Q: What sequence folds into this?
């Protein structure tokens, strides 16, 4: 057993472990919030004959 | 909290930093969290 404990700021994006850890690597599943309209998907049409 | 690179700021020695209102208390679901700015050098506020 080994407990993992972290804290991160959602604004500044600083992840940081704070409770324990004797490990080597961590894989995460974060994203980037579409609240501030930075990027999105465009659906511009197409046609051929 | 006494780090190795600490300063007491009550006596002029490397001692315990009294957490003045930046105390880490029990948050929700029974955990502590908090960043604290302790003075390292005596009269040089380098603030590790």
A:
């Amino acid at each position: 057993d080994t407990i993992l404990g972290k804290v991160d700021v959602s604004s500044g994006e600083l992840t940081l472990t704070s409770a324990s850890g004797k490990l080597t690597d961590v894989k995460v599943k974060g994203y980037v919030a579409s609240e501030q309209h930075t990027s999105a998907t465009n659906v511009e049409l197409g046609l051929t004959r | 909290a006494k780090w190795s690179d600490s300063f007491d700021e009550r006596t002029s020695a490397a001692g315990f930093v009294e957490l003045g209102s930046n105390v880490v208390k029990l948050q929700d679901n029974d955990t502590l969290v908090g960043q604290i700015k302790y003075p390292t050098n005596g009269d040089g506020e380098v603030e590790t």
In short: Residues 7 and 14 of chain B are 4 Å apart (CA to CA). Chain B touches chain A through two residues (CB under 8 Å). The two ends of chain B are 13 Å apart (CA to CA).
